[PDB]
Paper text:
Here, we have sought to generate high-resolution crystallographic structures of the cellular interacting fiber-knob domains of species D adenoviruses HAdV-D26 and HAdV-D48. The fiber-knob is the receptor interacting domain of the fiber protein, one of three major capsid proteins along with the hexon and penton base, as shown schematically in Fig. 1a. We next calculated the amino acid variability at each position in the aligned adenoviral fiber-knob sequences, which revealed regions of broad conservation corresponding to β-strands which make up the main fold of the fiber-knob trimer. Each monomer interacts with two neighbouring copies to form a homotrimer with 3-fold symmetry and a highly stable interface. Analysis of the adenovirus loops reveals an intricate network of polar interactions which stabilise their three-dimensional structures.
The HAdV-D26K DG loop is most homologous to HAdV-B35K but incorporates a three amino acid insertion, while HAdV-D48K DG loop displays a differing and unique topology. The B-factors of the HAdV-D48K DG loop were observed to be polarised about the hairpin, with the outer face of the loop having higher B-factors compared to the inner face. This is likely the result of polar contacts formed between Ser-307, Gln-308, Ala-309, and Leu-304 with Asp-359 and Gln-357 of the opposing monomer stabilising the conformation of the DG loop. The proline-rich nature of this loop provides further rigidity. While loops which are less flexible and/or stabilised in a CAR inhibitory conformation, such as HAdV-D48K should result in a fiber-knob which is less able to bind CAR. This hypothesis fits the competition inhibition studies shown in Fig. 6c, which demonstrate that HAdV-D26K has an approximately ~15× lower affinity for CAR than HAdV-C5K, and HAdV-D48K has 500× lower affinity. The known CD46 utilising HAdV-B35K is seen to bind CD46 even at low concentration, while HAdV-D48K shows no interaction. Whilst we have not been able to model the interaction of HAdV-D26 or D48 with DSG2, due to the lack of an available high-resolution complexed structure at the time of writing, we investigated the interaction by SPR analysis. HAdV-B3 is the best studied DSG2 binding adenovirus and showed binding in the μM range when tested by SPR, however, no binding was observed when the same experiment was run with HAdV-D26K or HAdV-D48K. We demonstrate that HAdV-D26 and HAdV-D48 fiber-knob domains have a weak ability to bind CAR, and negligible CD46 interaction, suggesting that these viruses are unlikely to utilise these proteins as a primary receptor in vivo.
Numbering used by the authors:
A (entry chain A), B (entry chain A), C (entry chain A): 2 to 196
Write the structure that this text describes.
């Protein structure tokens, strides 16, 4: 088989935030049985977040954006994802000139560990019987790889509607950045796999 | 064998902070030879930390709590842990209707890498010859999965006295939370295994 | 083979920041195919950062330092690294009284994922076509394992000149520490491997 499903190395951009080939997403999933081991970088090369300036454009919509990975019931990427299908496959093996095939359910984030979330009660004083938060990793990345340029990053599992599985990346910051390209330090986490 | 030792999926709560079935701890250990790969979520469903309000209860004891995993010399959970033994076993395999057995030493945190810590010198100006900190991962979780609701989380290895190995989770915050359920984003780290 | 390449357990110090045996670096690499799984602790036992006091020594050079791992084209440590070669090998196996040998290319950080970085344009307004940040994990450690004692830590891949591969650890803080030994909580991340 192959145990690593990733963003094939091409010099080309492969991702759309607002416009086609906005961005070059690096994303690597390596399977350790029950946990998938994730690593991700993001470079946005044109559009609103290549060179950010919030002194100029300070409205909320210029300080957050989202990226969506959307899979079918067999773990194949759907057209409507942010990531272009052509740049997403397993690593080498008998998948070198076997080219873009799939099944990949063992790389999907468990619908048991990460279910469709319930509807939060009417009263927020009322405590939950089951978790709204448990499908989110909330961490940071650093633009330019500089400690001074944080971007709050929320990875969320199986919360999108297009699909059967989903990995969603929601970035957002408060710092009023002045001329700073969105070019991220990498983020590493792990998640519970389906089978 | 099985390589993943975890909190069996049950809708039921499985953990005690102050009272029996206070809390529903999700905790997954996946073994990659020398490193154990950990993932953890926490939902507290009744007690002091289901709905936190520190405008009402502002004393130090309402802004910190602890969870303890305690193992014997073979890597079996002891009764006195926060986590209920009945909800802790390997993942499926020949352990589906083989039910709660164990040995699990390869999932234990190394007593060589994480020893009983020495006694810190009389003078704190005096520098150490061996580490007090090296058995702690110190990170955060996010209540509601919201960047604005951090909780400082200190995972500590083999520091408890009941036992032969130990994984301890010490949560604590300064934010004066007003009506906020302790429902955590997940935390991922790795640790050095025994054998 | 062996899948874990690490800092052999010895009570002795094994690392040089400014002077020989300054420091006792714990560092463990465990290979999961395409990703290397890293874990690191640091104790500095003499020199400037055993007992830090920035009320006394407040200049920039007393609030940052660096550690370098430098490998040849086969993944062998070079003399000039911060880490002493004698304390760095695979874990047991047929490498117990086979002693210090190597090849270890599969533990090296990919020169495809982590290349020699390009030269940042003349104008910083000009947006990049390829990433300057993508070879850095930027995170923290906690001196004494205390949430109140952060140290910003930047792990950087293949940026040094002595060598063919490199893992570099750049620590730095703003807090004016008063009498606090540099004794770190551990840091865990993963990185993309070569082959």
């Amino acid at each position: 088989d192959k145990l690593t499903l990733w963003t094939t190395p091409d010099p080309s951009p492969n991702c759309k935030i607002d416009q086609d080939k906005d961005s070059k997403l690096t994303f690597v999933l390596t399977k350790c049985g029950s946990q998938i081991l994730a690593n991700m970088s993001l470079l946005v090369v044109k559009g609103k977040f290549s060179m950010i300036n919030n002194k100029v454009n300070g409205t909320d919509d210029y300080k957050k954006f989202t990226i969506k990975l959307l899979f079918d019931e067999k773990g194949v990427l759907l057209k409507d994802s942010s990531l272009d299908k052509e740049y997403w496959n397993y690593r080498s093996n008998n998948n070198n000139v076997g080219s873009a095939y799939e099944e990949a359910v063992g790389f999907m984030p468990s619908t048991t560990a990460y279910p469709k979330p319930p509807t939060p009660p009417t009263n927020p004083t009322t405590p939950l019987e089951k978790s709204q938060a448990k499908n989110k990793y909330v961490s940071n990345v650093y633009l330019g790889g500089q400690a001074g340029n944080p971007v709050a990053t929320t990875v969320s599992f199986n919360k999108e509607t297009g699909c059967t599985y989903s990995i969603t990346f929601d970035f957002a910051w408060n710092k009023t950045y002045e001329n700073v390209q969105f070019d991220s330090s990498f983020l590493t986490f792990s998640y519970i796999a389906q089978e």
